[PDB]
């Protein structure tokens, strides 16, 4: 506060989110006879397809997961219109038309989505879309018929939109009635992932005797850490 000369200034305003760290379990069953006569390493091919499923099942909870027993992604965070942004919510900007980008002028709902973050979170931010949205972004054409993004019809995917990287995360919603199909923000600060650094797999012929019953589990968790560092793009108003 702007201290006056003889005011006897009084005390001013002095300035916790928990990450429950849930558990992701895989227990594939396999007959013991099979693990001896097959030529393929069924011991290892099951360990390859779990690590693939785990990196893909927690990838979806990171976006549209609820809080219950799984990491809550940023898309379940009581989204509020920008300009009315509060601390407990993620700010979104509207595209105009109710289905897709604005019919009269698209590519404008993106440049004000960029300039809705603040020059401090834009130091390292990146768009996050699924596959069929970057296609709808690339289908954006000006009045002449040329592409706004990746000008020539050759040489697609310029790996930069408005000067910022693009992460094609295929677990976000597509373009729909009110979907937030494009998210932009600094997730290095905005979304914190808490995880245990190992994928434990342990065999046990003991649980079911004629089988092996591989057990595989990992502990991961995470929600938003900075509501000011993630903006979404609602396709409704």
């Amino acid at each position: 506060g702007w201290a006056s000369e003889t005011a006897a200034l009084s005390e001013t305003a002095t300035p916790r989110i928990t990450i429950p760290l849930h558990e992701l379990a895989a227990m594939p069953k396999a007959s013991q006879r099979l693990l001896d006569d097959s030529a393929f390493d069924i011991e290892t091919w099951l360990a390859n397809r779990i690590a693939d499923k785990f990196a893909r099942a927690e990838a979806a909870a990171f976006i549209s997961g609820d809080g219950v027993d799984k990491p809550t992604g940023f898309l379940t965070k009581t989204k509020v219109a920008n300009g009315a942004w509060a601390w407990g919510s993620l700010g979104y900007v509207a595209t105009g038309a109710a289905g897709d980008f604005a019919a009269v002028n698209a590519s404008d709902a993106v440049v004000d989505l960029v300039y809705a973050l603040g020059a401090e979170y834009r130091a390292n931010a990146s768009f996050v879309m699924n596959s069929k949205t970057a296609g709808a972004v690339r289908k954006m054409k000006d009045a002449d018929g040329r592409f706004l993004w990746a000008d020539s019809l050759a040489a697609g995917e310029p790996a930069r939109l408005m000067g910022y990287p693009v992460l094609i995360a295929e677990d976000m919603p597509d373009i729909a009635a009110n979907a937030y199909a494009i998210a932009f923000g600094d997730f290095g600060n905005g979304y914190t992932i808490a995880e245990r650094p190992d994928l434990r797999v342990l065999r046990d012929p003991f649980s079911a005797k004629p089988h092996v019953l591989f057990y595989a589990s990992k502990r991961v968790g995470g929600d938003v850490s900075d509501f000011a560092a993630i903006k979404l793009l609602k396709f409704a108003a």
Binding site: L35, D36, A47, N48, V201, L202, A216
Partner: protein, 370 residues
């Protein structure tokens, strides 16, 4: 080798055997958990890295040898002392020592990597020989192949009488004594942190059997207790206690020594398993050895030089498969500074025994004859 077919098919050929179930947990609570298990490894791992080596093939002339050029700097960012302390630091911790070798040129491989034995598992194979080793970080295998002549991993084992494929790791033998020393130290850490001794209690029963004192009385009671009766500056105020009041002084009846003699006895069994003498690391107790010329000589003879002579014996056989000629690496047992009292009485016996000539006692002491 004739018995190899029935011992390999018993556990299951071609599939990984994971080994011990808690060596990955004993590193967290027995080496980074207590100081005694920490120091006992670091005293041995930094002593076996200190001893020089001898490269000999029938003339011992190889002081410019490529293996001694290899071991002097194994790989970029890990010297000779940092290689063996990381290698012995896997042998004492999980009973298994590993060395990757990368070789662009087919002889004398360029780099030696101490692969950690937490994430390594054997493949018992066909003829009782492990065909593969699987380096499992995350959920990803590697499967080195040893169906060849160079066999890219030497596997240094400690003695294990029950298992066919791993070692015993003296930390695993003292795992009950690590849990006594970790918990009796956390007994005292807890007891200092959540325990209530009062220096006394001021009983106010009142006219009834039970009565609290009024809030005007409670501020008065604290203010004559805070100002006049507490602190070091008020030790002995004669404390007029009127009717109803009473000061019942409390005590703290075990003060010192909460599991103190069962912690030091558990500290010594940690030092007994790895093999250090307790005067070396600094455990208090009875002086078994006398004056550090004995205990440091007993340290390099009971638990260092028996350990280093078989790590270098596996390096003598695994490396020699990379270069035609066979190599023999063994510790020096000369200008190692703790065997000086052994070396004095060798030179004083043969030095004073003047019945034989000078050129005959140079070969007894190990000198070049003249």
């Amino acid at each position: 080798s004739v018995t190899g077919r029935i011992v390999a098919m018993a556990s299951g050929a071609g599939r990984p055997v994971w080994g011990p179930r808690d060596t990955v947990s004993l590193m967290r609570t027995g080496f980074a958990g207590n100081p005694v298990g920490f120091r006992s490894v670091k005293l041995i791992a930094e002593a076996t890295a200190a001893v020089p080596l001898i490269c000999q093939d029938a003339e011992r002339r190889y002081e410019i040898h490529p293996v001694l050029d290899l071991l002097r700097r194994p790989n970029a960012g890990q010297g000779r002392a940092e290689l063996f302390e990381a290698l012995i630091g896997q042998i004492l911790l999980s009973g298994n020592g590993y060395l990757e070798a990368v070789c662009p040129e087919p002889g004398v491989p360029r780099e030696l990597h101490v692969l950690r034995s937490d994430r390594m598992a054997v493949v018992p194979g066909a003829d009782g020989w492990p065909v593969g080793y699987d380096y499992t970080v995350g959920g990803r295998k590697h499967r080195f192949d040893m169906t060849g002549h160079p066999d890219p991993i030497c596997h240094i084992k400690s003695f294990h009488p029950t298992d066919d494929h791993y070692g015993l790791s003296p930390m695993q033998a003292a795992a009950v004594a690590l849990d006594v020393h970790n918990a009796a130290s956390a007994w005292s850490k807890a007891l200092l942190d959540n325990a209530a001794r009062p220096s006394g209690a001021i009983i106010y029963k009142g006219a009834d059997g039970q009565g609290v004192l009024a809030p005007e009385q409670y501020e008065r009671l604290i203010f004559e207790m805070e100002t006049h009766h507490q602190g070091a500056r008020n030790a002995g105020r004669p404390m007029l206690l009127e009717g109803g009041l009473d000061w019942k002084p409390m005590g703290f009846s075990p003060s010192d020594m909460e599991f103190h003699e069962t912690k030091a006895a558990a500290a010594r069994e940690i030092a007994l398993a790895f093999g250090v003498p307790p005067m070396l690391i600094g455990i208090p107790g009875d002086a078994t050895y006398a004056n550090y010329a004995e205990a440091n000589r007993a340290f390099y003879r009971l638990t260092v030089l028996p350990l280093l002579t078989r790590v270098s014996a596996a390096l003598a056989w695994w490396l020699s498969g990379y270069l035609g000629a066979q190599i023999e690496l063994k510790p020096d047992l000369d200008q190692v500074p703790a065997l000086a009292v052994e070396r004095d009485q060798l030179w004083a016996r043969i030095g004073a025994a003047g019945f034989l000539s000078n050129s005959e006692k140079r070969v007894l002491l190990g000198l070049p004859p003249t």
